[PDB]
Amino acid sequence: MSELEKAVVALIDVFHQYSGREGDKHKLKKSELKELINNELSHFLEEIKEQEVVDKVMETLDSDGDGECDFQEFMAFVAMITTACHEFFEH
Amino acid sequence: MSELEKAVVALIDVFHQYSGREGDKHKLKKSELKELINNELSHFLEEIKEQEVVDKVMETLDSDGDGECDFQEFMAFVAMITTACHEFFEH
Numbered sequence: 284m285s286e287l288e289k290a291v292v293a294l295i296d297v298f299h300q301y302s303g304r305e306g307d308k309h310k311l312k313k314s315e316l317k318e319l320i321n322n323e324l325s326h327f328l329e330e331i332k333e334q335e336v337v338d339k340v341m342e343t344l345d346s347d348g349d350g351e352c353d354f355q356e357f358m359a360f361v362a363m364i365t366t367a368c369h370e371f372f373e374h
Numbered sequence: 375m376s377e378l379e380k381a382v383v384a385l386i387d388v389f390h391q392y393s394g395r396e397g398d399k400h401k402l403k404k405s406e407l408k409e410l411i412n413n414e415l416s417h418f419l420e421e422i423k424e425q426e427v428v429d430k431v432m433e434t435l436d437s438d439g440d441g442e443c444d445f446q447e448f449m450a451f452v453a454m455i456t457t458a459c460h461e462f463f464e465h
């Protein structure tokens with residue numbers, strides 16, 4: 284498999300490593316999202332230590348108002364993070 | 375770096391491995407997009423052998439009508455491919 288194909292699989296793998304822990308196995312609730320960010324994005328994003336901070340991230344990511352981040356919404360999060368990285372985190 | 379962080383970097387790396395070959399160094403023209411798909415997505419997508427086929431992919435991906443796929447548009451392509459893979463390529 285190419286690096287791109289492996290990367291695609293990694294995105295799926297990390298989502299399901301967190302989404303399945305609690306409640307709906309197909310969505311990240313705020314507690315799962317906090318864990319994913321703190322454990323898997325520690326070199327790109329600041330550690331989340333306050334509930335208000337993860338509340339704000341979920342508010343941004345949750346486009347259908349169910350209070351959770353589904354796979355489609357996670358893809359949008361990935362695009363945000365990747366765009367930030369692409370621009371050398373300048374913004 | 376986590377697998378997710380490495381995956382993010384891989385997405386950026388593969389874009390620039392193709393976008394820089396011709397013309398605008400920041401965008402994939404159809405010829406570059408064809409190369410990327412045939413070389414880096416050979417286990418996920420059918421090989422492109424006809425100009426009409428890459429014309430159609432670019433028509434789908436090109437949201438600002440410049441005839442090329444920029445980084446934002448590439449992210450949308452990645453989301454499409456990843457969603458397809460996530461659903462076991464059933465559709």
Ligand SMILES: c1c[nH]c(-c2ccc(OCCCCCCCOc3ccc(-c4ncc[nH]4)cc3)cc2)n1
Nearest residue numbers: 326327328329368369370371372373383386387390
């Ligand atoms: C304020 C809040 N957070 C911050 C902040 C957080 C983190 C940080 O830095 C994080 C560590 C970086 C490690 C990854 C290295 C590779 O990433 C690439 C690879 C290719 C391109 C690229 N782009 C175009 C061509 N190549 C661009 C980036 C900087 C600021 N500041």
Ligand SMILES: c1c[nH]c(-c2ccc(OCCCCCCCOc3ccc(-c4ncc[nH]4)cc3)cc2)n1
Nearest residue numbers: 292295296299417418419420459460461462463464
């Ligand atoms: C018609 C046109 N093209 C086709 C077609 C093309 C290619 C193909 O298969 C391609 C090869 C697959 C190799 C990658 C293995 C891992 O990918 C994963 C990993 C996790 C999940 C997942 N999802 C949820 C939980 N885990 C889902 C998928 C099948 C049909 N048919």
Ligand SMILES: [Ca+2]
Nearest residue numbers: 302305307310
């Ligand atoms: Ca869950």
Ligand SMILES: [Ca+2]
Nearest residue numbers: 345347349351
């Ligand atoms: Ca949602």
Ligand SMILES: [Ca+2]
Nearest residue numbers: 393396398401
């Ligand atoms: Ca180019």
Ligand SMILES: [Ca+2]
Nearest residue numbers: 436438440442
């Ligand atoms: Ca375009």
